Structure formats: C-alpha cells, structure tokens
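Suppose you are handed only these lines of text.
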Amino acid sequence: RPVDVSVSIFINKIYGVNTLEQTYKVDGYIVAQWTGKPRKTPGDKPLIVENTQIERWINNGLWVPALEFINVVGSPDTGNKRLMLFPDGRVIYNARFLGSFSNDMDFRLFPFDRQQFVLELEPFSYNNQQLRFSDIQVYTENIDNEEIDEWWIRGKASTHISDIRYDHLSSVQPNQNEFSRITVRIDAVRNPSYYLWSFILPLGLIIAASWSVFWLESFSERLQTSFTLMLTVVAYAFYTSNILPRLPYTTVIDQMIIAGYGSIFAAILLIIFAHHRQANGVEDDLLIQRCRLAFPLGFLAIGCVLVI
Amino acid sequence: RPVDVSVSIFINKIYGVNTLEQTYKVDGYIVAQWTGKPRKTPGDKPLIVENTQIERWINNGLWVPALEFINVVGSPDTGNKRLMLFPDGRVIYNARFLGSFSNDMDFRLFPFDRQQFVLELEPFSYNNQQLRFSDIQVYTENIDNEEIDEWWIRGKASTHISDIRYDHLSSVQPNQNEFSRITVRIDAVRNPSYYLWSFILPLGLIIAASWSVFWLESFSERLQTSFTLMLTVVAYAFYTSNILPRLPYTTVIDQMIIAGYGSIFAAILLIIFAHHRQANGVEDDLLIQRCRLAFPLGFLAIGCVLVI
Amino acid sequence: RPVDVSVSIFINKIYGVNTLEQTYKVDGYIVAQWTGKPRKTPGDKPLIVENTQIERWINNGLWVPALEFINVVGSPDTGNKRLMLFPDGRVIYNARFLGSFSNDMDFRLFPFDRQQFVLELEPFSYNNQQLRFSDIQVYTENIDNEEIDEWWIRGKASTHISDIRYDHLSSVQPNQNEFSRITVRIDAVRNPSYYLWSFILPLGLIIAASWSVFWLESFSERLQTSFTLMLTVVAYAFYTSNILPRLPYTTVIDQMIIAGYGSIFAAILLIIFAHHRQANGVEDDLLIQRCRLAFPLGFLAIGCVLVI
Amino acid sequence: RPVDVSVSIFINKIYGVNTLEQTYKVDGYIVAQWTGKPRKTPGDKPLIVENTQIERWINNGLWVPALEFINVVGSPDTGNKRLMLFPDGRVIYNARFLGSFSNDMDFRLFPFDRQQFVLELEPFSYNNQQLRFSDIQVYTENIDNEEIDEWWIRGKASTHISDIRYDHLSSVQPNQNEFSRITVRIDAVRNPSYYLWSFILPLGLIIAASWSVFWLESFSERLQTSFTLMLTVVAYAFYTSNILPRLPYTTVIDQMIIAGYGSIFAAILLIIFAHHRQANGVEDDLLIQRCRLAFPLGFLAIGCVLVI
Amino acid sequence: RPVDVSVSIFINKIYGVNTLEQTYKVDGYIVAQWTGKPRKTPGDKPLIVENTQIERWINNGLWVPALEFINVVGSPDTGNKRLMLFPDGRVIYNARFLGSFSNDMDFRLFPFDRQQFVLELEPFSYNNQQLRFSDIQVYTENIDNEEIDEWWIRGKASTHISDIRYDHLSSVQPNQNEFSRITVRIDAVRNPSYYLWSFILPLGLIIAASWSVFWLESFSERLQTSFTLMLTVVAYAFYTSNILPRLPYTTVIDQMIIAGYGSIFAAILLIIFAHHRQANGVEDDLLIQRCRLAFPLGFLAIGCVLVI
Ligand SMILES: [Cl-]
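From them, the structure of the protein bound to chloride ion can be written out as follows.
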C-alpha cells in the first residue's frame, strides 16, 4: 500500500568543509519518481511544469511529498525544480540543490585524515506504510586532475535504504512510527602535499636546528641561543595555528610543536646543568657532546612513537 | 477555557558559539499539539498538510497560533512545515528550525567554563487565559564521540513551564497580561584539551625558562637576554589573542600572560639592582643565585593565589 | 484631523557595534496604537491577526501606516507581526524587529569612550497633519551581570518626539512638508577592563623596560639592544592593530605606541650622541646616567599632555 | 511622444568601501515623478499607496517603469516603497535603497588618493522615445565633524543626464535604442591621518634607525645587527599588509617597504665590502666613516625621486 | 519541431576569484530570443512585461523556458526580468544576473598562472528535440592592459554550442536524452607585478643576505646568526601565507621559501662541519671561504632549473 519512490542523486561538487562546525557543502540534483492515478495530458506526450507552476499544481491537489535532507544545516538553496507529469500515471520531481550538511568528523589524524561526506534523505511527514524509498541511485563525476582538488574522492558512493523508528511520537498507532531513509556515503582523504612541504618539513628542520644549540663552544653562547630558538617555535605555532583549520583538539602538527617546545626546554635544563654538575662549576664538555646527537636520537625515538 | 498546547522540541545540533555576542546556534524540530472543533477529513484517516498549504488553511480560518522564540536573535531559518489535522478535533504542528539564540554567558573561567544553552518559547499574541503550555518534552541524542565535539553536554535537558507578567500593556485589565512560557536548558562544559596542551603548557615552559636568566654569569648577558624574553611573551600574547575568543574581560590564560610580563619586568628591576647593591656598588652575584630559585618560588607562589 | 499614534519600543539587545561603519545591532519589539472607525469583531472581544493575514486585511483597506527607522541600514529583519483589532475603533500593531542602526560614533577616547545608541522613527508617507506621534514609551531590561556585557548601559532611555522640515516638495500648499519623529537615545560606556590589563599595562612595562637600555655599560651593548627594542614595539603595534577595532584615526593606545617608537628613536640619538659628543672619543657617560631618569621622566611627562 | 521622468536622489551614507571588488555602499532614497492618466481618487486629494499595495495597482495595469542602477552589484536592498497618485494625472514613486555600487578606483597614490563615488541610473526596458529623464536633482547632507568619517567629500554632487547607444539590440530596429541615463558623481579624499601617524612615520623612524648601523664600530657588530634590522622590516611589512586594504598593485607604503629592504641589503653589501677593500686586510673604516651620512642622503636622494 | 532559442550574454564584470573553492563572480545580462504563437498586442507595437508581471503571463500559459547556468553555485541573484512580446510571434527574455560560477582552476604557476572564466548554459527541462540553441553571442568590455584590473584578458569570448547526452532518466525512443548547451570561455592571465616586487623580490634579498653568514669572522658568530636568519624565514612564511591566496598545493613562492629553509639548514650543517673536520682542532677557513659564493652559485644555479 505505501507509495514506492525511486530516488536519484547527482553530486556535482563537495566543497567548503568547515572543521569546527563539522559541515561541508554539496551541490547537486535530486530526482524522485513515483506512479499515481493516470492523467490526460496535452498530447499523449508527457507534461512539463517548471518552478512556480508546481505550486499551482500542488494547490489544486497534486501529491508531491516533501523529502527532507536530515543532516542539512539550514534550508538548502534550491535552484530550478521540475515536474514531468506522464499520462500513464508516473510523475518525476527534479530539482537542483545547494546545501550545508553535517556529519561527525574526526580531524585528529590531520593532515592525513579520512572523512566521509554524507547525505541522508527521508520523507518529512509520511511513514513507510504511506511512503517508501524503493531504490537509490547515486552519480558522481570522475575527477581527472586531482591536485587541482583539495580532497580526493576515493571510491564510488555507497547507498542504503533503511528504516527509522521514532520512539517519541504523537499517536503511536503501532505501525505508524517508522520512516524510509536513503543514506549516501562518499569516502575521501585529504591531499596531504601542501601541509607536508610547507609546515611539517620546515618544523622538522627547525627542530633539527634546535639541537645544534649544543655545538656552541661557550655556555653563555648555548644558553642565550636557546631563547632565540624558543621564539622561533612561538613564531611557528603562530604561523600554523593562524593558517591551519581551527579544532578542539591537538593534531599531528600540534604535537610536533609541543615537542619542539620541550626539546628546547629540555636542552635548557641540561645546558645549565652542565654548568654546575661537576664541582668548580666547570662547563661539562663530556655530557654535552653526547647530547649533541643523543637528543637527535632520543627525540627521534620517543617522538617516533605516536599512532593514536 | 484557555487552549492547552503540548510542546515537544527535538534537538539535533548545538553549535556556533559566539563568545562576544553571547549566542549559539540550534538545529532541531518543534512540535505543538492541541484540540479544536472536530473535522471532516478524507477517509477517517488524519490529514497531512505540508509547507505551502498550511497558509491556505489558515486563510479559511484555521487557528494556527504563533509561538515565538523569545531569545532568538533574528528570524530563525525554518525548514519544512507540516500540519496534521485529525478528524477527532486535534491538530499537530511540526516544524524544523535553525536559529541563533541568546543567553547570558560568562567566559571568565575559560577554557574551563561551563555554560547552559537555552530556548525560551512563548506565544506571540495569546496570553495564558487564551493559550497555555500544558507540558514540555525535550529530546537530545546521546554522545559517544565526545572528543570530536567542542563542548561536553552534561545531563539531559531541564524543562520549565511558567508564566510571565508584562507590566506594560495597553488594554491591561490586569488579568490579561500574563503569558505562558516554556524554557529549556542544556548544560555543557568546554572541552579543555586543545587549550591545555597547546597554550597553557607552553606558556608555563616559557615563563619557567624565563627564570633561567639568573643562571647567566655576566650582567650584560642577563639584561640583554631579558629583552629577547620580553619579545617572546609579546609574540605569545599575539598568538593566543588571535586564536582565542575575543571577550570584554580577561581570562585565566590572559592573566598568565600578564604574569609572564611581570616576572620579566620584575627580574629586570633586580638584574639591574644587583649591579649596585650594598657598599662599594658591587657586582653582587650573591642575589642572583638566591634568585635562581627564590622567585621561581616567589612567582609560583604569589601566582598560586589566584582564586577568582 | 491628524491621526494620533502611540508608540512603545521594547529594547532587548544592543550588540554588534561596528566601529568603521559606525553602526550597531538592535533587537526589540515595536508597538503602535491609533484609533479609527469602530468595527464588528467576532464576539465583542478584540480580534487578533497574526503575520500573513495582516496582508489580507490591508488589501480590504485596513489602514496600517508605514513607520520607518530613519537611521537603520537596510530593511530590518522583522519577526512576527500582530494586529489587535478592537471593536470600539482602536487598533494595535505589534511586531518584533532586528536592525542595524547608524549613528555618529567618536572612538578617539578609546577604550574610555562614551557612545549613544539611537533609534529614529518616522512615518514614511504621512506628514504631521495626517499622522502624529502622540507619545513614546521606551522599555529596557535591568542589567544585573555587568562584566558579562561588553558595554555598560548608563541611564534609562531618553526619548523625544519632534518635527522635521523637508525642504523639497511636489505637493502644493507648502505646509505639507513636516513629519512627526520619535527619537530615542541610550548612553553607554565601554568596559575598559580587558584593555587596561592586556594592552595598556604591558605597553607601560614594555615602554618602561625600553629605558633600561641606559643601564648598559658598553656602547655596543646599548645601540645593538635598542634595535631589538624597536622590533618589540613593532611586533606589539602589530599585536594591537590586529586585535583592536579598526579605525580611520588614532586612539590613545595608537599614540602611546608612536611615542614608544620615539622613546626608542630618541634613545638611539643620545646613545650615539654621548659616544661622539666629547673630545678624544671620551665617552660622555654623563648623558647616559643623566638619562637614567631624564627619559623615565621626560616621557612619563610628555605623554601626560594627551589631554584631548 | 516620450514620458518625461524627473528624478531626485537623496544620499544618506556612503560607506563600506571594498578595495579589491572596487565597490562601496550607498544608502539613500530615490524619487521619480512623471505625469499620466488623470484619475478618480478618494477625495480630490492625492492617494498614497505603500509597499504591498503597489504591486496590486500594477496588476490593474498601472505603469510603473523599472529604473535600474547600472553600476550596482546584485539586487539592492529596497526598503519602503510609495506611490503618490495625484488626480490631476501625476505620479510619484518614492523608495529607500541600500546598494553596493561598482566603479573604477585607482589606489596607487594610497593613502593620498582621491576617489569618486558614483551612481548610474537607466530604465531597464524603455528607450528614450518612450521614457526620457527630464531632470536630475541630488541631495546630500553637510557633514558636521569630519574625522569621525573615514572619507571627506570635496565638492557638491555632480549630475548629468545623457543618452546611451546599445549597438547589439532587440531586432536591428534602427533608432529606437539609446537610453536616458542619469549619472551622479561625488568626489572624495581619504582621511589620511591614521596612515601617516601609525604607518608612514614609524616606517621612516625604522628606516632611519637602520642607518645608525654604520656607527657601530666593529664589523661583526654591523653585520649581525643588519639581520636584526632585516627581521624588523619583515615584521613591519606584515603589520602593514595585514592591516591596510588589500590590492593587486604596489602603493606608496608598499614602495617605502621595498626601499627599506634595499637600504639594508645595500648596507650589508657595504659593511662587508669595507672589510675587504684595503691591503693587509685592514678594515676600511674610511668608507664606513663616509657612509654614516651618505645613506641618509643617498636613500633620501635616489629614494626622494619618487613622484609616481 | 524544436524551438530555436538564440542567446546573447553581456558580461559586465568578472571578479572575486575564490582560489580555494575554485569559483569566480560574474555580473552581466542574459537575453534569449525565440519565435512563438503570433499575438495581439496593444497597437501593432511590441509589448513590454516587467518583473512581477512575467509571472502572470506564465500563468495564462506563456511559455518561458528555464535555462540554467550549469556551472553556477547556488541560485544566482537575478535583478530585473523583462519580456518583450512581439506581434509577429517572437519573444525576448532579458534579465540581469549576478552569480558565482565554477570551473577547474590550476593555481600552481602562481603568480604566473593563466585561467579561463567559464559560463555553461542549458535548458533545465527541455531536450534538443524540444528546445535548441541556435546561436550564442557574447559581449564583453574592451578595456586593455589595465592595472586597476588584477587580470589581463587575452581575447574576446570563445564559444561552443553542443549536445549533451545524459545517460540517466526515462527516455522515449532514446534520443530524448540529449540537451543543447551553450558554453563560453574567457581566457586571462595573472598580472604578476605586485607579486614580484612585494614578495618574490624581498624573498630573494633575504635568501641572499642569508649567505653573508659565511662572511662572519667567528664560528660563534656564524652559528648564532643563522638561527636568527631561520627566524626571519619563518616570519616571512607567515607573512606570505597570511596574505597570499590559500591553496591545497605549493606555488612558486612556497618553494622559494622552502628553499630558504634549506639554504639555511644546509649552511648550519656546514658552518658546523668546517669546525671539526681536521686533526689539530684547526679552524678550517678555506672550506668556508669556498662556500661563501659557492652557495650563491650553488643556489642561484640549481634553483635556476625548475620548469614545471
Ligand atoms: Cl530517552
């Protein structure tokens, strides 16, 4: 008894990912098909009804169900819409849409994070004994030039009709609380190039160069230099944080920078220890030289151990 | 004989906290139920009226009352609208909404502050002798993925029907100036992760290592380093302020920064005092070693007394 | 013959002050009452007419005058509208509004500036001989938690009905050119808290500590150090401008910084004067030392004459 | 045969200049008068028709021509609309508008440049043989206190009706092209204070103080300091670039900053030259002796010759 | 049988390129002509129908086809709409539009890149057997070699009408799946002036002067100074990236900056290598000296290689 609705979603563009709000933008078309009481049309050719006229057809009692994007954020921008009314009953609703969609997004493995962009589609008023999603086709384009793009869409889209039971309701009438829901997934990974060459690498070099504090001859030389290195790291945290996506947690990159702060606070604790370890506050030429490429080892070891 | 209206608010998303405007974004549905004169429907099955058609029904004199979000800021984004008209008299209005809401918000304990997100719902035109909130249900989803999220939602929602007396009204007759008001509350706390490891921690280290000025042997060495340290805290002041939420008052982190400014202006008053102290204006290297761990203590103590 | 219109303006929130545009955001309700030809209502109870239906009443020639916010910037966001039609002739228009309003704003005494938020309300089409503002009430909230707020509202609201002469006319009889105008004022001052503790104070310390250049023994030490001080004032100027409101003129803080640039450029001229003033390249260790409290005096004085 | 249309444009506010789009915001009223079919009005008094009602008269076939702002950017925000319909034929359209307008803008002499704010107005559908602009008045406020304002208006507004020939139009249909176009101009100059005192001045001082490197006695002193001076200019370029309006070409300031870079790269080339010119690798303190006031001239000379 | 539609697109302004979204803004008019049912108009003079009225005519069964900008992002801002209805059947739709358009954009050769601005137009509902694009005229402004302008256009617009075969939908004899599509291209090149003089040039000077590290006398001098140069490169990356367009890949300039990090990290690996190679812990000043303008070749040569 429920109406069978066949859905097709064409996806043109996924862009404008907002990390903090955990949202992304989607431009595409949506197509919905169902069959009803047949109709006498001009000619026996199908009838086309564009935009403002659909309202009039609905006002004279044409059945056009809602279909709401569950995970949209604010009313999406709908472009031109179309009704194609067939004489043998059918009907097809075709409309373009631009919307901001929500999903959980874990950006902790940044800049090597994998995300999946999702659309969820569900009738607004009609349960599965009134309206049912029969099948979902999903269409995406084949991106020829990938570096142009920030994200690489890795796979064809996964689709799945399913059924949603709403437990807190108006009247239960025990079979009127389940809804048909299309769910669409598109997996993707971040193009990690720019973030490697322009942030990760320089932070490496600078962190390396921090260790060369030890190869200064004087103690005064070594300790005063640490303060300039300290500053370089502050400047660097400022650089990354101002240009990298804002988040509520530490990334790979954020960790490197805290490491940088420590390697420098560490050396300062040693550089100053050397100068008082032995009696006669003689600078301690034995301990330092070892640190010179022990640190580049010890940091390169206990720093090599995060896979969280 | 006031009309009893039963309200249910499903809440999907709280996001977009604006610290300075003291606002937040809320996505959800709102449901309102009431009973009126019974009705002739197609079949004896209830009638559904979606979006554009509700307006037409209102035009034939269907009572669909206002209901205003008292604390919304600007007309909220309304998604789909639905009326369910039952034959047995009653009526259910179901709508999706995205709005920017206002509440008082104290950000002084940042990044360890707790807040409560609030909705206030009240009829726009009809008082409690005409329209009364019978009961308010509020539903939230439960959160497994919490680190992902910026805020931590504590407990399920507090609800509140009450009556508001408006003293300034034209045809007052003071038994017609009281309005029925739902009020919903959601407590939440800030996820202090990012702010601890990436701001609080390094600022300690920087303030710490600032103290290591005293272990420089020369005076020229100590004073010249002090100006570089000064610069570093400024660089840090810029770093935090550019990334932390703007507020009209100082947070914890801002005070740490003023502290760093103090510890360093302090040492400069000493580092230069030593250079003249007792008789024979001696290069009194004696104060400095006291200082080496005198006001890493004197600071970590006189700073230990912030309890606002 | 002129219509008497009684206005009440409830003010909920004054926020979002934009310095450069000289504007601010105002959320509130507006109420207008005027009385006309008596009327048949259902019962002898008043008729309430919400939102979309007002249009219908206006089409059948219900007189609802304009009322324009003279000093708004763009058509305001209007929430719900309401007509209360009384049987005994009278009529009340009640609507919620959010708007961006313009007034003159002098930010020179920042962050110790005083401003006044203003609404100006005027009939759009009907002059003072057709439509007249009889009286104006303005209602505001009681601000209990004052630091929470960026601005402190100091006073209850000032109101003023008046008459405006428009110099240009296309209707004959030159006495059809004056309009009734409600005018409302609200004075307020900026919470100078954040700005003293996070900018002014360190700017003192930073400016002060620049003077400790003179307590350096060498000339090499003194001149090379001043270049580092220079960099600090620059980095600090960068800090302020990025975080302070952007403007087209100098505030105090902007000036302190320029002085700061001078305090350092001067010092550089002495440090270099001393070192070549006297004969036989004898150092003029007297100028330095005379300076030790000439500058901390001459500057903490020559800045005291910013009494504008 | 054509209708004569008399226009008046009241200008309230010119604000919100966007340099890169080369646009600006204009708030004002527009008034159009023309005479048509005489009419049966209530009374022999003119009839006022506001907002929603104007559309209705147009549906009964009232001629209300378009009028388009040629140089606007996107549909302007139109506030209240008014028709004053006189019985003696004539017709007045009065509307408030806020719009973003585009004009060519040359910012090379920034911050000492003059600009002219412009409106261009032309009917959307009707040529000059159907609709003709008879005459154009423009009304602007006098402006009380000028620095409050970012821009200073140098002149009363220029007006100019003209006729524009469109070469590719309708059919061929010769001689029914050409459109009546009002054009309004307002010249203005930038309030150049802020940019002198907070940018030009300190950059001079920074550049000046750079020259005092030559007065360092050692070579090590002079060369190592230059790298600090370098850093200062980078820091300064960043201060300016982040805070000044963005453009696609170099301004005055942008050039001064390139100068600062060269003046230092030059100095690095000299400072290191002296140190190798003479025999027995003696420092060539004779050259650096000369430079101390060669640069303040040589820079202020071949750098003075900026007259672009 | 299909209707021939002749399109003319006037382009006023291409602006607001968004690098990250790969979009650009286009302001212009669009005109479409086709011939239909002959018609009785007032006089035998053609009839004009503006804005709101078009909707009326469409309701009495006037055919005004969709026409969608295929590569637009969101419903574009449509200004005034116009129908010109001719007595001999034909019909012209003239409308103004401001829209945000999408194309693939490769910014890797920035700031020396060439891009092509694109419009794509296609009927929304009607295939090529119903509606056919006869021809596309494009009109653009002629202004030439212009600095006010950010871009240099390389030619008048190139166009291409075609037929697009859609693999998916309910087809009659499958030739009802092809659509007529206008396509417009405008090539343009980035004017690299600003970017050479204000970024490339100083980055050169800075990289150069980094080499004068080798010409420092001491080893302490050489190693301590390079840490300052490092800082400078860091300060510069922050400068460039904060003001240059955001992208997901490295540009020319980005590479130059990575080079600077290398030029300095290399030097540090050397400055410290020289100082330990030989027996008799001898200073190794030949190898240094050789490096002094070995780098300036070594860099200015193999960096002079890139041809991507
Ligand atoms: Cl539950």
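What can we learn from it? Helices of chain C lie at 52-59, 193-211, 219-243, 252-277, 287-290, 295-302. DSSP finds six helices and eleven strands in chain C.
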